[model samples]
Target: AQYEDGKQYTTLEKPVAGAPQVLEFFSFFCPHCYQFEEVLHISDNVKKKLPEGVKMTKYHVNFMGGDLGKDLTQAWAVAMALGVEDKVTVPLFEGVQKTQTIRSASDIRDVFINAGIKGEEYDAAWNSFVVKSLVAQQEKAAADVQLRGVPAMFVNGKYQLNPQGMDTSNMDVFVQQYADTVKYLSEK
Candidate 1:
């Protein structure tokens, strides 16, 4: 598979410091993003296909539901702060996208609580500086890029994913092709 600038990726005006690092800007309220994770075998395909030293980072945006989106971002940060991401990530996604069970911040807090984190521990995570800063970073990432869409991916913080090169009929082909482009972009 072959890809190039303007076809596979667009160069960033001001690049971030990230080679061998990929970042995805997304939201829980986004169906496409949800599909990518839940239905796509993301961890098994895309994630595992990346070459060694390539790590993917996810940043939740605060624009999906406006104020509610910010709340969800906070919830995500809190989950990470408490190291409950394994237990809560997909559950939170299902709650927001599929089950639609989350109605308010309290309900989100329960998601963390139900993940086995104790009540006081949940509060500590909520109030912790790391969690607060994480929320801030998420907000900043969204605002800095003025990202208008979910699942927007970037390689080395400079090359933005282009859809044309990613359009494929086979999932495995898609995975390998994407990994190749990612490595190329990182090393370019």
Candidate 2:
């Protein structure tokens, strides 16, 4: 996952262990990301239907948080530091979608803090120069691709969904198109 406003951010270069890569670049503040989370969360049954060698990753962008951007970065950095990516990311989404109060970095932080992450440790991670630098790097990456929307996807960095390439009106078609693109890239 990538943070949008940190002076630095981490890039995932994990070799998919014989799988293809599907990077789902999203943001905590983006309503579109909420839509994807609401609709496409992978259950065991859904996971089984994915093509062989297909893996999905989430990247959270923080540019929309204004002055509280660093705090948003902290919210994500703390989760990564604690190795609770799914835990933090999942609840973060639900909080945004179901609750009307998740409109700022403070809101994002509140969710993580309530979720049991230590406040001090989270502060340390958020202020870490390393995390800021990594976040900055990811910002550059998003720009390089001319990324225009949240909850967007890149299949092996080749094809994109959401704001690029094709935009489908049907929800299922859009989601399946994403899966099919990942499959297509994997078979290449």
Candidate 3:
């Protein structure tokens, strides 16, 4: 996805950095997002086949996060703040879904605690500069897409996946095809 000022572009920009990019906008609470997880593996496979500098970044689509999205924006900020992303992503995913299941942030906190991040570390993480910065960026991303739902994606700045634009019979194929389009952009 194209970068904008004041918005935190993913620091994960690969070797090509500003070369064309791909971004997947998703929500852990959305079942369709869960279904897209399977196709994500295909995207991963495509990633391996990427041309020298192509890369992708996962952007959370927190439609339900009125304040939760803000909190999650902070939570992820905290994770990066702790510099423990390798330890945080899975737990966060679990936490996001748990929030969907049990309906609370405390439950999600329990998951993070289980991941070996807590207390001051967690607190410090929750208030991390990067997390706060990203949350700001995420809000901008949501605005840029005029977001209406979860599991959306875009290549460069266009070629987006609109769940509304899809045929119910071919959702899976659509995601797979989306990945193909991303891979093609990399090759281009």
Candidate 4:
């Protein structure tokens, strides 16, 4: 269950501070990313498997450039800013990919509203300069790394891995192997 130095993951040019930065580059509209949620048991796995000081972040990938993709990215940033991630994260993915719902800011606002975020909070977060800035930063990150696909990972701001490149027979094996690689890398 070991990963090669450059095959499974590649080192980043610069390291992030304080901890091993584990980033997941994904899109709400990506069907594979949506399936990864259940297949990987990410929520549970993170709590149980990820070691202390390993910071995991989900960054929305905006390479598609469509209105829907752009809107979802903004929606993700807004949810992040408002601190309602636990409430809206799964629903955001489900609404867009599973139910074929959620297309624009207005649609996303409805999801936040259902999650108990006030209209005022939603407006402030959605229209705020900070949220927009966050979205822009994420876009630059995607471009800077030349990320061409969804469900990619960067560990310690250095190591890069894509599930597509992983040698595994099933989702469970992939999840375990990825976690093991992350744990091994984080300890170093």
Candidate 5:
């Protein structure tokens, strides 16, 4: 089956306006999320295959109930704030999940530096009030939506594309299915 509303997915109380939004709520420390990077080859598919009239936003979840959660989530928010998320998202996952090198705030900073982000610039953004507030906002948004897992997708902020019953054996097929689902919901 494709996605069935209410059962396969739930409706958001309030949707974000503008172009239909496809928000992906993820975390760096999530092993499943890291596997998504490997299976989906995300950035390429997102840039090339995402349907028209749709926008994508990656929100980092901070509800791990510990400093590790806060540190990694803040690093992701900082990467987005610095406009380096596109370059660092997958690498950050690899750094933590594959290499097991990124475990603290300083480690995250070094990862950014290795990605060509100047130390001073990284320092400025990583600790900026804007990034801090953005992380807090994302946490609240996740809580608002009753998010329960990593790699959750909210389309138009109203229809969430639940993969629980969907076929994910093939990444390419799964992505196309997701895009089709998003297109369907956006038109409605």
Candidate 6:
């Protein structure tokens, strides 16, 4: 998304001189996303196989974080705004899913603060007009997908991965299929 959520719109409407974008719709509360990060390492698989200059976007859906869904996504938006995505993602995930400490906005702010961002910056980005706009579009997109679950990947707008077609028990096949599916979709 060129470090911005709006990039997905451009990549969708007009294919630039690169590979099509892959919109990864997931929630931080989703065990699938957590496992993909912590256990399966799906992003590594995707990264190793990605073509040159291809963009992979991770979108946090505001439907599964329970009452704090939007808040959690807002937190991620703020992190992206502050250029601390590489630093705060794991801690935030650990805080939410494992440590069980990130229940409020203050907790999220603390996580970012611990990751080296100042409180004022996090607060500003958290309440900033631009970050708020992204959360709205991200939520609208999640609703548009009529999602029934977490961890869905989409190409263009309507095309997506079918979980039934992939085998997860065998890790290699699952990884290969996951990687290849993204590659295969971008090819067309």
Across residues 90-145, which tens digit of lDDT does each residue of candidate 6 receive?
A: 99889999999989888878888888998787788888989988777677666666
lDDT of 3 at 161: 41
On residues 1-188, what C-alpha lDDT tens digit does candidate 3 reach at each position? 43232221212222322323676666656666655664344346546655657566666656765656655655655664566655755555655664444246565566568788767667666666666677776666666657687766555654454344334476656555555555654444
Q: lDDT (0-100) at residue 30 of candidate 6?
A: 90
Sort the candidates on lDDT, descending order.
1, 4, 5, 6, 2, 3
Once superposed on the true structure, which residue ranges of model 3 sit more than 4 Å away at CA? 1-20, 38-43, 81-102, 162-176
Global Cα lDDT for candidate 4: 0.75
How well does candidate 5 score on lDDT at residue 175?
A: 68
Instruction: Tell me each candidate's TM-score.
Output: 0.87, 0.67, 0.68, 0.86, 0.85, 0.82
Once fitted onto the true fold, the runs of candidate 5 whose alpha carbons sit more than 4 angstroms away are 1-3, 6-8, 12-20, 42-51
Tens digits of per-residue lDDT for model 2 on 66-172?
A: 65544555566567666777667767767766665677766777776887877886677777887776576556556555666666655555444332343557767
Best by TM-score: 1
1 or 6: which has the higher lDDT?
A: 1
Q: How accurate is candidate 6 locally (lDDT)?
A: 0.72
lDDT of 5: 0.73
Backbone N/Cα/C clashes per model: 0, 12, 3, 1, 0, 0
lDDT of 5 by residue, 1-188 (tens): 54577755667766655422667788877877776667775534653556665567778887653687788888888887888887787678888788988777788788888899999998888779998888887787687678878877776667886656567788788766665665676566
| Residue 52, model 6, lDDT | 56
Give lDDT per model, in order.
0.75, 0.57, 0.57, 0.75, 0.73, 0.72
User: Which pairs clash in model 5?
Assistant: none
Q: List runs of model 1 lying over 4 Å from the truth.
A: 17-20
Query: Residues 108-178, candidate 4, lDDT per residue (tens digit)?
Result: 88989999999998888888999999898778767766789887777766677645567677767777777
